[PDB]
């Protein structure tokens, strides 16, 4: 967190999602690392995956 987090913002956001479990968030992060161009895509799908798993 306490660094130039603005650069690695997508990765940081995927970590900082309450409803994602380890396997999910880490899996998506590795997908992002594997395919840098799909940053916005992976981030969007991570937020969707989090949202669907919201207790409400």
Swiss-Prot record:
Compartmental location: Secreted, Cell wall
Biotechnological utility: Important immunodiagnostic reagent because of its ability to bind the Fab and Fc fragments of a wide range of mammalian immunoglobulins.
Immunoglobulin-binding region E repeat windows: 1-56
Family: Belongs to the immunoglobulin-binding protein SpA family.
Main function: Plays a role in the inhibition of the host innate and adaptive immune responses. Possesses five immunoglobulin-binding domains that capture both the fragment crystallizable region (Fc region) and the Fab region (part of Ig that identifies antigen) of immunoglobulins. In turn, Staphylococcus aureus is protected from phagocytic killing via inhibition of Ig Fc region. In addition, the host elicited B-cell response is prevented due to a decrease of antibody-secreting cell proliferation that enter the bone marrow, thereby decreasing long-term antibody production.
Subunit and partners: Interacts with host TNFRSF1A; this interaction leads to the stimulation of both surface expression and shedding of TNFRSF1A.
Entry text on domains: Each of the immunoglobulin-binding region repeats can bind the Fc region of an immunoglobulin.
Name of the protein in its database record: Immunoglobulin G-binding protein A
Annotated source species: Staphylococcus aureus
């Amino acid at each position: 967190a306490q660094h130039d987090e603005a650069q690695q913002n997508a990765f940081y956001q995927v970590l900082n999602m309450p409803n994602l479990n380890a396997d999910q968030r880490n899996g998506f992060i590795q997908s992002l690392k594997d395919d840098p161009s799909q940053s916005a895509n992976v981030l969007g799908e991570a937020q969707k995956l989090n949202d669907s798993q919201a207790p409400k």
